[PDB]
Amino acid sequence: PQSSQVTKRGLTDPERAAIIAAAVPDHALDTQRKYHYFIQPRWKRLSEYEQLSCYAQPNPDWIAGGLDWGDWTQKFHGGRPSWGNESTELRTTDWYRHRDPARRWHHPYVKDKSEEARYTQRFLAAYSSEGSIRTIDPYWRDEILNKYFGALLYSEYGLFNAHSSVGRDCLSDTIRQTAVFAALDKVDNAQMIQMERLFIAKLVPGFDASTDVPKKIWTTDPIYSGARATVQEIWQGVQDWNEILWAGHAVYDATFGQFARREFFQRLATVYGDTLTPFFTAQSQTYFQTTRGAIDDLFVYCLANDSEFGAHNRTFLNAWTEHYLASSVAALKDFVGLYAKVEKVAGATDRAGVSEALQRVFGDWKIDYADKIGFRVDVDQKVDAVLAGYKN
Amino acid sequence: PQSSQVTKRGLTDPERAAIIAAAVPDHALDTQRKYHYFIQPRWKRLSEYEQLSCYAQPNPDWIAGGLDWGDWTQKFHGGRPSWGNESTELRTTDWYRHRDPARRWHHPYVKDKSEEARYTQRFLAAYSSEGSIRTIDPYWRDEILNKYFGALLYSEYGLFNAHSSVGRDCLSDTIRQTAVFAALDKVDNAQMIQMERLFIAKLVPGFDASTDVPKKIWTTDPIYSGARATVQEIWQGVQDWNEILWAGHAVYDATFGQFARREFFQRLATVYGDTLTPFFTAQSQTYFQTTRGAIDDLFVYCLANDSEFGAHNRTFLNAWTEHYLASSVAALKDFVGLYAKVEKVAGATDRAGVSEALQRVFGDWKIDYADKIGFRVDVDQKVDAVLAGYKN
Amino acid sequence: DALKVNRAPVGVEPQEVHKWLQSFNWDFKENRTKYPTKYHMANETKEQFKVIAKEYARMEAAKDERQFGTLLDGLTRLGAGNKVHPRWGETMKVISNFLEVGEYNAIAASAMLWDSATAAEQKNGYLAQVLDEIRHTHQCAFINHYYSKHYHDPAGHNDARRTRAIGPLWKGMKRVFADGFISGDAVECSVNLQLVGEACFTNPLIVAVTEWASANGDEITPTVFLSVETDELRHMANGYQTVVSIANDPASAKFLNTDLNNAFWTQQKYFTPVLGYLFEYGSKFKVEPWVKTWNRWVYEDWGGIWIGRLGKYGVESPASLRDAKRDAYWAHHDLALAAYAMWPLGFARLALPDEEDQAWFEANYPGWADHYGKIFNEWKKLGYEDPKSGFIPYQWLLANGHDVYIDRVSQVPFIPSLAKGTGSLRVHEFNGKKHSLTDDWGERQWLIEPERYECHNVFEQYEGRELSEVIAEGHGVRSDGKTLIAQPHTRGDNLWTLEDIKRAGCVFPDPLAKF
Amino acid sequence: DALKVNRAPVGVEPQEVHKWLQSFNWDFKENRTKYPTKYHMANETKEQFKVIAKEYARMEAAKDERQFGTLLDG
Amino acid sequence: SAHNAYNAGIMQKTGKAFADEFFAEENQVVHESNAVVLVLMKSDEIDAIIEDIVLKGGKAKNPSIVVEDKAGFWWIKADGAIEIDAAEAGELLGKPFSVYDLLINVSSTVGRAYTLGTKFTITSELMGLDRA
Amino acid sequence: SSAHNAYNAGIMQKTGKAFADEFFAEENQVVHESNAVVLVLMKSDEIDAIIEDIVLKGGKAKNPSIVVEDKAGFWWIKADGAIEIDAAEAGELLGKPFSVYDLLINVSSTVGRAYTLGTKFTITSELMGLDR
Amino acid sequence: AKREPIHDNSIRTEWEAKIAKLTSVDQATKFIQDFRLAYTSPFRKSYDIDVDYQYIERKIEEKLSVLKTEKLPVADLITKATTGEDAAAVEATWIAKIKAAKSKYEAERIHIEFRQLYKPPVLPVNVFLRTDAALGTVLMEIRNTDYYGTPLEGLRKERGVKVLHLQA
Ligand SMILES: [Fe+3]
Ligand SMILES: [Fe+3]
Ligand code: NA
């Protein structure tokens, strides 16, 4: 036995189920069965993503778009509201407008990453059994990949922590979900970089997967000097949560981050015989494009084209872009000094190869971000600015 | 209303639930709750994989290991039994002994491949958005990858269909599951090769993803002459289901298949700037090692070491190996003529690079298969035989 | 070039890959089936459900996650595993494990269709079907696996893969949806397995049964069985494509009507009495008369939507249908007599029909009370349920001249002196061996094809042996080594032991010795 | 080298990555909280449930599948 | 259309009346039927499809549709054909729902079934035999 | 056994005025240190097997103070000192992969200091970082 | 008659003792062919070991197969029957034999006797399965020609059964 009563279930206990059946009316008391039917659908019909996310944040009418009323029940010492317009320079007619084009609420997000989590481990057990590490260029593996791809995890880690204040300060539910999912993907990138290094250590005797060398390079090597200065500022130098998201994803990671991950480590892996790294960069680059879709909607669809504050917001976005683009080309100018340490491959690591890589990064960024907010940029000028740090 | 009665559920309807509760005894009628507790466990504890799979095949006692008795109820015209010892030369004390080391029943199998299916499409949507195809060597893309990797799908397709008679003829449940899962992975490989070609066609104008050229190469190009002859024989030339599984997976696909997929297309992708193909070869190579574990258990653990028929089975396995290794060495001798069409890369496509690739494949195969059945093989002799087809 | 490319997000949908599957085959002289067949017509067809390997797994894994969520989370938290009426919990020992062997043999049969297919798209579709039948094998196993863990009698749920070999009803199961599929013409499987088996009999066997489970408190089986049948849409579609090509070639079409009739009789000979017995006698709450279930699914819908529609193209109504309809009305009542009389040879606990059941039987089958009802009530008065009675009805049958025979072809038991369903005993001696046949259709099969039908029956194997020794040898006991798995009642007390069986002194005779 | 390597099947468990997480931080003058607080004590501690991003997603998705299966199906 | 009901025709009779028609001479051969039978296992997505698609736009197009509750599944019978557009269901459910996802809970079919684009169809037509 | 760890132990046995008198007694207006721990496991196939074959056998054999109560949707467990569950033991019981992460799928609540050490989950009355 | 236990009885034990004394491929081939002619198929000579012959046949197969691998060269295992005949010639001989049969009754006995004589390990498995399938094709086709043409009374006479009982 037990001290407390074994509760009878109303669903299956005959006596309680009969009582419930007598109390339930023989008809529905309303016909509106669409959960939060009054959400304005972005697409042709209301999505489950919107139903579960939208208006979860209890904003009052004095925060643009809020449906509630009155002041907060408890504020900070001094009077800072729980959420407030003072949290960002940007303005809108409705902070709820943002929609992730991937329509990620929590379940589809972890569902997809769970697939990547389990398949990765099956890939590693098979890769180690295949012995494919035997054909990788050892200099690339030991002197470039282990040290400088390892150092790059600190860039992804810093971008992850830049979201801590964003997760507290931002003013709507869909934005908060976008920000947090982007943060996890960044710390995932840094953890996946370390996972590959620990994995290689099991295959190559003498290969040191410790973070001692990568951390020393990230903190003192001039190759990452500009990048680390930019990450420290975006992470800990600002609290405007829109500035952090824009500078982090739309400027820095869209230029330096894409060049380092895609143009250097992923691309050069496929010229130095690295059959392992492309599996890991496949994930970080997938995460980048997913994040970009949501970041693009927040800043381009919603903020840069807000019916009342579009030009107002572009003024700040232009100023932020000018500052953080200068930071990013300075980071790239420092970073391209790493080509002086790699084995030369024509069309990839020579001046023409690096120039064409910079033209892709700056050119794609002009189309994906600059053109959409009215930021004028001379692509060739930025390429030549970075190439000034390339040793011929 | 409706013409038929709305059946009341015994679980929730008060009247029927009370009747059921009065009829159910107040105690269990046995304490043995382990489903098929009498299965001899391979590992320290009985697994759910074994519980759901083992003795599903209703073999009688005159088929080694069967628990039933008597003749079949209906046989073929002439007298061929539903299952029979005449289906294979190999003998054992118990056909039920085989265990997939991955312990795959149907659910974990489709669960894992579902992860790969959905992640693949997310990877392709991001890869196309990344534009990473821009840095691939166009000659490799158009003249080697599209044509000869496309031709390789027909090898995977033929190996898939080689399992059709095995799925009917084999004599136990765990063996049948191993064979069918291996067959799906092969036809998956052929479909994934075509998927990559169709994907490239959406990114490169003028890139023809039709199978006309790959099929013409598979059926008429001397580079695939030996491979196609071997696949036709394993698929349609024999019905001994143990010979098919051994010749297909343990000899041909372990030698020619591993060289083509891993040493040629996957490896050279990482010297010609191909950031796309490694994502697809990652899957086929994962599938190969999973299949190998199950193939290894059937032929090495169970058959080559069966207490009564081990040496008997090794006699047949040795004869099969000698024949199909010669076929595979002739296939590789034809195949290495493809190196005359590739751009020369020191250590990868020169004679020394091809020699080391053959040493890995033949060397791994001696350790993974030949040593385990007592098949003596001179690796350097087999390497030099293939290199006779290499154009200096 | 190196700078400009279309960066629109694209993938590759399954139908984009599928359109090129037909070109994956190539021509060579040995590219043909390995199995004997009468059908050699052109059969390059297109499959109606485009599927590739990656999408196959995605579809099935999605079905599984919802199914196992219901079983392992929700229903377990509700304790639903022990909310089943004992009659139906015992019935699922037989239904799920017997279907399991049908699913398992369907793997091998689908592999023959895979092997005998000539179009790459058709080989692709049959591999998916082969995989589905593996899934269904493990689904059926999982039902008994779950019952073993949560139901008040795990014995028989936990070991049927060996305890089924004891009893005679298992012999016929190895033909109806097993040997009858895989031991014959490979492309003919499109007729017996698919046009008949999947398109006709899976609906009452797998779908309709779920309403009987729910009526008797079982929500585990509907969760699984209804998921099983979702795969059958592709299986039926695969077979229909081949049946079309057979009907279109005059040389192939001349085999179709005979193969159809033989398939329909072979399957219905066992399916009709056994499933009808398990539905009506292995339940407390009845959904409908079994003969109405059979009329709705077999005669009217399958016979009308498939066979009747195909009549426009030379497919004939099965000549054995008249004999089959008589079986639909009475044969499951005949089988109940043999099942109750030989209960110690099974692995399930049986329940004699109570007064409410008897009224239902007589209302829906007038004449049942004066025949079957009087027999069951006489057995009860003799102590059918009482372990100390020393009474087992099989000896009672013999003492009153009600011999039980086994059809050499179908393995279905036959009691000619008590049967109301289709049948008449034919006893032939051939080459010094006696054979008993029970209907016009099976006797033709045996007379023309004797080397296909050499199945030993329980009387030939058990001849002269005492009942309790056969049961003990076959592991037909619970974990105490003495109490029988099978029981003549569904109560928790007064369970029969091997010694209780032994006191009756039942010895297996040679039923053909008198001929 | 190019021929010999350990081909034993290995992966990387979550705890293997997690042991290096503490080294992901680096020192700089602005590396401190943005919010007002009365608490400024040393607080370099270890979390009792080692988790990384991939393993977090695997755990929660497994919970979800059973939960949504029960709701939408059973 | 009551002729498509589960208990239509002979299924209304019981006792001797049922047996008399069941064993009648004209009922010892099959009778061609222009109907189709669709079975959908109950679930959140399917019950929404039944109420707002099959019993609305479905039965508006095909008034012969009969839907019956069989505890664990839906029983559907109609003349000629039954169709379900996965794109319409996807708009109803508010979540990704391809034609492959629709088949997750499509349990049984009596008739010729296929998928054409986003639409699932079960039809009385004998494709490959009947004139196109 | 140990009745002091029962859900309805002590004051929880009383009703009416008797309960109110002790609930409002002067000595019960401050918290009292407890050496106990409370573990909650939501019901499922895996958990119900763990409860019967681990917690109520070897668990209570090590810690005879363990009390387990049925709370419809979950298990209520209370014991002196600590409660431990070895995922490796559960994996041997279930016959399927079962890491300590998989064990936590249905571990709902904890009152005490909880942690994972290898394959073992433990909730303890010890104040780690403060005690000893 | 009283049958002994199913899986362990004096008949199986006694026959296992006979099998253990086979020492050559020739002796075991004659042993297995005589056994299959005497105890298998509807045209067997004796049903005296009916519930044991299939298990005993398995044990004879195992003995002959091990003797083959111990004594015969590899090429003989692939291209020759243990009678010494060329395997391909055996296939062609029996395919031609059944294609010349003038009735299903002639065709059925050719297929049955082929299996009795050349079932593995006598013939190599690959050759046997090819021939068995080719023979079964012809047998199926001639049997399914006018399947219902002959009444049961005529079929009983054509088969040659002794009709012991016909229920009224
Ligand atoms: Fe099935
Ligand atoms: Fe099927
Ligand atoms: Na501070």
Short mmCIF file of C-alpha atoms in Angstrom, two decimals, chain A residues 12-317:
data_model
loop_
_atom_site.label_atom_id
_atom_site.label_comp_id
_atom_site.label_asym_id
_atom_site.label_seq_id
_atom_site.Cartn_x
_atom_site.Cartn_y
_atom_site.Cartn_z
CA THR A 12 -10.82 5.56 -17.44
CA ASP A 13 -12.46 5.18 -14.01
CA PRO A 14 -16.10 4.23 -14.73
CA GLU A 15 -17.65 6.25 -11.90
CA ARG A 16 -15.69 9.45 -12.53
CA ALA A 17 -15.99 9.12 -16.32
CA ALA A 18 -19.78 8.87 -16.05
CA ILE A 19 -19.89 12.01 -13.88
CA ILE A 20 -17.73 13.89 -16.40
CA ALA A 21 -19.90 12.72 -19.31
CA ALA A 22 -23.00 14.10 -17.57
CA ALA A 23 -21.30 17.49 -17.05
CA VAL A 24 -19.90 17.96 -20.58
CA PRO A 25 -22.41 19.79 -22.82
CA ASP A 26 -23.77 17.99 -25.88
CA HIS A 27 -22.45 20.73 -28.19
CA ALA A 28 -19.52 23.09 -28.57
CA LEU A 29 -19.85 26.51 -26.95
CA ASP A 30 -18.01 28.28 -29.79
CA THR A 31 -16.95 27.40 -33.32
CA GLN A 32 -13.64 29.33 -33.38
CA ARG A 33 -11.08 26.55 -32.87
CA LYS A 34 -8.08 28.37 -34.41
CA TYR A 35 -5.61 29.09 -31.60
CA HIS A 36 -5.08 32.87 -31.54
CA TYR A 37 -7.09 33.39 -34.72
CA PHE A 38 -6.48 37.15 -34.49
CA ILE A 39 -2.75 36.98 -35.30
CA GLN A 40 -2.16 38.72 -38.61
CA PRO A 41 -0.79 35.92 -40.84
CA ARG A 42 2.34 36.76 -42.81
CA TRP A 43 1.60 34.05 -45.38
CA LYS A 44 -1.55 32.74 -47.06
CA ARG A 45 -2.81 31.06 -43.88
CA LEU A 46 -1.87 31.19 -40.21
CA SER A 47 1.03 28.86 -39.42
CA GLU A 48 1.54 26.80 -36.27
CA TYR A 49 4.83 28.65 -35.77
CA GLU A 50 2.93 31.93 -35.50
CA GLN A 51 0.12 30.49 -33.36
CA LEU A 52 2.57 29.20 -30.75
CA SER A 53 4.95 32.20 -30.77
CA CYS A 54 3.08 35.43 -31.49
CA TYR A 55 1.96 37.69 -28.60
CA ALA A 56 3.59 35.43 -26.02
CA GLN A 57 5.42 38.58 -24.93
CA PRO A 58 2.96 40.61 -22.79
CA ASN A 59 3.79 44.06 -24.13
CA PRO A 60 1.53 47.03 -23.33
CA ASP A 61 0.26 49.50 -25.91
CA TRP A 62 3.13 51.93 -25.23
CA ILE A 63 5.56 49.39 -26.71
CA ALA A 64 4.69 49.45 -30.41
CA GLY A 65 2.38 46.53 -31.20
CA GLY A 66 1.57 45.53 -27.63
CA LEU A 67 -2.00 44.49 -26.87
CA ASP A 68 -1.92 45.00 -23.08
CA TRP A 69 -2.21 48.21 -21.06
CA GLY A 70 -0.69 49.96 -18.06
CA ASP A 71 2.75 50.01 -16.49
CA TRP A 72 4.75 46.97 -15.46
CA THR A 73 4.11 45.51 -12.01
CA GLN A 74 7.77 45.74 -10.94
CA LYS A 75 10.60 47.71 -12.55
CA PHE A 76 14.34 48.02 -11.97
CA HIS A 77 15.66 50.23 -9.21
CA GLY A 78 15.56 53.72 -10.69
CA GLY A 79 12.65 52.95 -13.03
CA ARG A 80 13.96 50.86 -15.96
CA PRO A 81 10.90 48.98 -17.30
CA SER A 82 10.82 45.21 -17.71
CA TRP A 83 10.97 45.87 -21.44
CA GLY A 84 11.22 49.35 -22.88
CA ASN A 85 11.77 51.47 -25.96
CA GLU A 86 15.03 52.69 -24.39
CA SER A 87 16.56 49.29 -25.23
CA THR A 88 17.29 50.16 -28.87
CA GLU A 89 17.66 53.13 -31.20
CA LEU A 90 15.49 51.53 -33.89
CA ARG A 91 11.76 52.22 -34.08
CA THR A 92 8.82 50.38 -35.64
CA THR A 93 5.04 50.50 -35.70
CA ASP A 94 4.90 46.90 -34.38
CA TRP A 95 7.71 44.85 -32.81
CA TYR A 96 5.72 41.63 -33.43
CA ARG A 97 5.98 41.83 -37.24
CA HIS A 98 9.13 39.70 -37.54
CA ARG A 99 8.75 36.19 -38.96
CA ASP A 100 11.50 33.60 -39.23
CA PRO A 101 11.22 32.29 -42.83
CA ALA A 102 12.19 28.86 -41.48
CA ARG A 103 9.24 29.17 -39.04
CA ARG A 104 11.26 27.64 -36.21
CA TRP A 105 9.60 27.28 -32.87
CA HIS A 106 11.47 25.14 -30.34
CA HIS A 107 10.40 21.71 -31.60
CA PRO A 108 11.44 21.92 -35.30
CA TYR A 109 14.68 23.56 -34.17
CA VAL A 110 15.85 20.75 -31.87
CA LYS A 111 14.33 18.18 -34.23
CA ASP A 112 16.69 19.25 -37.02
CA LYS A 113 19.77 19.67 -34.82
CA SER A 114 19.07 16.26 -33.26
CA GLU A 115 19.37 14.76 -36.75
CA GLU A 116 22.74 16.46 -37.20
CA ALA A 117 23.85 15.36 -33.72
CA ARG A 118 23.24 11.64 -34.24
CA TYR A 119 24.38 11.47 -37.88
CA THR A 120 27.66 13.22 -37.01
CA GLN A 121 28.62 10.46 -34.56
CA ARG A 122 27.76 7.75 -37.10
CA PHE A 123 29.89 9.60 -39.65
CA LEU A 124 32.88 9.79 -37.29
CA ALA A 125 32.76 6.10 -36.35
CA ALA A 126 32.68 5.21 -40.05
CA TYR A 127 35.31 7.80 -41.02
CA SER A 128 37.72 6.47 -38.38
CA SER A 129 37.03 2.94 -39.64
CA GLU A 130 37.64 4.10 -43.22
CA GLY A 131 41.07 5.52 -42.39
CA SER A 132 40.49 8.40 -44.82
CA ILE A 133 42.58 10.71 -42.62
CA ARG A 134 45.65 9.01 -44.14
CA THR A 135 45.60 11.17 -47.30
CA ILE A 136 45.33 14.62 -45.67
CA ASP A 137 48.26 16.98 -46.17
CA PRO A 138 50.05 16.82 -42.79
CA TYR A 139 51.23 20.44 -42.91
CA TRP A 140 47.68 21.69 -43.45
CA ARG A 141 46.43 19.35 -40.72
CA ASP A 142 49.05 20.27 -38.11
CA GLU A 143 50.12 23.86 -38.83
CA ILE A 144 47.02 25.46 -40.41
CA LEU A 145 43.91 23.41 -39.57
CA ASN A 146 44.67 22.45 -35.96
CA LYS A 147 46.00 25.88 -34.97
CA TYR A 148 44.03 28.47 -36.95
CA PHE A 149 40.73 26.65 -37.44
CA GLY A 150 40.98 25.90 -33.73
CA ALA A 151 41.60 29.58 -33.02
CA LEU A 152 38.48 30.42 -35.03
CA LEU A 153 36.27 28.74 -32.40
CA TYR A 154 36.83 31.78 -30.19
CA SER A 155 35.23 33.96 -32.86
CA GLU A 156 32.15 31.72 -32.90
CA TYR A 157 32.17 31.60 -29.10
CA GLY A 158 32.29 35.39 -28.76
CA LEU A 159 29.44 35.82 -31.23
CA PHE A 160 27.43 33.32 -29.16
CA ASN A 161 27.82 35.31 -25.94
CA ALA A 162 26.95 38.55 -27.76
CA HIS A 163 23.34 37.29 -27.63
CA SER A 164 23.12 37.14 -23.81
CA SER A 165 21.93 40.74 -23.46
CA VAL A 166 19.82 40.37 -26.62
CA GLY A 167 17.89 37.46 -25.11
CA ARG A 168 16.95 39.69 -22.17
CA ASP A 169 16.41 43.06 -23.86
CA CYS A 170 14.72 42.39 -27.21
CA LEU A 171 11.10 43.41 -27.51
CA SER A 172 9.15 40.56 -29.11
CA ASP A 173 8.69 36.80 -29.09
CA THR A 174 9.67 35.97 -32.68
CA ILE A 175 12.79 38.14 -32.37
CA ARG A 176 13.79 36.44 -29.11
CA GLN A 177 13.42 32.99 -30.70
CA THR A 178 15.53 34.08 -33.68
CA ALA A 179 18.21 35.51 -31.38
CA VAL A 180 18.42 32.46 -29.10
CA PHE A 181 18.47 29.93 -31.96
CA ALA A 182 21.25 31.95 -33.60
CA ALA A 183 23.19 31.94 -30.32
CA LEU A 184 23.00 28.16 -29.95
CA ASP A 185 24.17 27.69 -33.55
CA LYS A 186 27.24 29.82 -32.81
CA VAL A 187 28.28 27.94 -29.67
CA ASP A 188 27.55 24.78 -31.66
CA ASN A 189 30.06 25.95 -34.29
CA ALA A 190 32.72 26.49 -31.61
CA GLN A 191 31.96 23.11 -30.03
CA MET A 192 32.01 21.38 -33.43
CA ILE A 193 35.43 22.87 -34.22
CA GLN A 194 36.75 21.43 -30.96
CA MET A 195 35.02 18.11 -31.68
CA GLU A 196 36.90 17.76 -34.97
CA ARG A 197 40.22 18.53 -33.26
CA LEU A 198 39.56 16.00 -30.49
CA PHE A 199 38.54 13.52 -33.20
CA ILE A 200 41.76 14.01 -35.18
CA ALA A 201 43.73 13.50 -31.95
CA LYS A 202 42.36 9.95 -31.76
CA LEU A 203 43.62 9.25 -35.30
CA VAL A 204 47.03 10.97 -35.41
CA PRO A 205 49.61 10.24 -32.68
CA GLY A 206 51.30 13.45 -31.61
CA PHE A 207 48.28 15.56 -32.63
CA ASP A 208 47.46 17.86 -29.70
CA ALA A 209 43.76 18.75 -29.48
CA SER A 210 44.27 21.06 -26.48
CA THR A 211 43.00 24.62 -26.89
CA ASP A 212 46.27 26.08 -25.55
CA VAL A 213 47.71 26.91 -28.99
CA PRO A 214 44.40 28.05 -30.58
CA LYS A 215 43.69 30.33 -27.62
CA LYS A 216 47.21 31.80 -27.73
CA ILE A 217 46.77 32.48 -31.45
CA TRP A 218 43.31 34.02 -30.98
CA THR A 219 44.53 36.32 -28.19
CA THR A 220 48.00 37.34 -29.47
CA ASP A 221 48.55 36.40 -33.13
CA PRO A 222 48.11 39.48 -35.37
CA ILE A 223 46.29 37.26 -37.89
CA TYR A 224 43.24 37.37 -35.58
CA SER A 225 43.95 40.79 -34.05
CA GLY A 226 41.25 42.68 -35.95
CA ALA A 227 38.70 39.87 -35.64
CA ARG A 228 39.04 39.61 -31.86
CA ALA A 229 38.82 43.38 -31.44
CA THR A 230 35.57 43.38 -33.41
CA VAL A 231 34.05 40.45 -31.50
CA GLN A 232 34.90 41.99 -28.12
CA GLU A 233 33.11 45.20 -29.14
CA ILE A 234 29.97 43.53 -30.53
CA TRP A 235 29.76 41.19 -27.53
CA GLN A 236 30.62 43.43 -24.57
CA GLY A 237 30.91 46.99 -25.92
CA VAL A 238 27.27 47.65 -26.83
CA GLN A 239 23.83 46.83 -25.43
CA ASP A 240 21.52 48.08 -28.21
CA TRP A 241 20.18 44.63 -29.06
CA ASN A 242 19.48 45.54 -32.69
CA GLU A 243 23.03 46.85 -33.10
CA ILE A 244 24.43 43.57 -31.74
CA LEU A 245 22.35 41.41 -34.10
CA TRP A 246 23.13 43.59 -37.12
CA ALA A 247 26.84 44.04 -36.44
CA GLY A 248 27.25 40.40 -35.45
CA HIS A 249 25.41 38.53 -38.20
CA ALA A 250 24.87 41.04 -41.02
CA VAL A 251 28.32 42.68 -41.07
CA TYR A 252 31.08 40.84 -39.20
CA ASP A 253 30.02 37.21 -39.62
CA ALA A 254 28.72 37.93 -43.13
CA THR A 255 32.16 39.22 -44.20
CA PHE A 256 35.02 37.96 -41.99
CA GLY A 257 33.10 34.93 -40.76
CA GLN A 258 32.08 33.78 -44.23
CA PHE A 259 35.59 34.32 -45.61
CA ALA A 260 37.27 32.41 -42.77
CA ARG A 261 34.80 29.52 -42.68
CA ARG A 262 33.89 29.19 -46.36
CA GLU A 263 36.69 30.81 -48.38
CA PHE A 264 39.62 29.64 -46.26
CA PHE A 265 39.06 26.52 -44.17
CA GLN A 266 36.28 24.84 -46.17
CA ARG A 267 37.64 25.81 -49.60
CA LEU A 268 41.31 25.05 -48.93
CA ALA A 269 40.35 21.74 -47.33
CA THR A 270 39.34 20.68 -50.85
CA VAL A 271 42.76 21.60 -52.29
CA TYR A 272 44.93 20.06 -49.52
CA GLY A 273 43.23 16.65 -49.40
CA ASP A 274 41.16 17.27 -46.25
CA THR A 275 38.20 14.86 -46.41
CA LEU A 276 37.19 15.61 -42.79
CA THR A 277 36.77 19.38 -42.37
CA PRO A 278 34.08 19.80 -45.10
CA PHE A 279 31.74 17.66 -42.99
CA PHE A 280 32.01 20.17 -40.14
CA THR A 281 31.91 23.35 -42.24
CA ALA A 282 28.80 21.94 -43.95
CA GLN A 283 26.96 22.47 -40.65
CA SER A 284 28.28 25.94 -39.77
CA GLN A 285 27.49 27.15 -43.30
CA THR A 286 24.00 25.65 -43.14
CA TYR A 287 23.49 27.39 -39.79
CA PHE A 288 24.69 30.69 -41.30
CA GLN A 289 22.16 30.66 -44.15
CA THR A 290 19.35 29.70 -41.76
CA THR A 291 20.30 32.55 -39.42
CA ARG A 292 20.65 34.91 -42.39
CA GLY A 293 17.05 34.31 -43.46
CA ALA A 294 15.71 35.40 -40.07
CA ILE A 295 18.19 38.28 -39.69
CA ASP A 296 17.27 39.42 -43.20
CA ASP A 297 13.57 39.51 -42.30
CA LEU A 298 14.11 41.47 -39.07
CA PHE A 299 16.31 44.22 -40.52
CA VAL A 300 15.19 44.42 -44.18
CA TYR A 301 11.50 43.48 -44.31
CA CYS A 302 10.54 44.85 -40.88
CA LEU A 303 12.97 47.59 -39.85
CA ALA A 304 14.56 49.11 -42.97
CA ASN A 305 11.10 49.26 -44.61
CA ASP A 306 8.89 50.04 -41.60
CA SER A 307 6.10 52.25 -42.90
CA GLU A 308 6.87 55.08 -40.45
CA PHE A 309 10.50 54.49 -39.43
CA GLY A 310 12.17 52.87 -42.47
CA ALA A 311 14.41 55.81 -43.36
CA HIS A 312 14.94 56.55 -39.66
CA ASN A 313 16.19 53.00 -39.13
CA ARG A 314 18.37 53.05 -42.25
CA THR A 315 20.13 56.10 -40.78
CA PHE A 316 21.33 54.05 -37.81
CA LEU A 317 21.89 50.91 -39.89
#
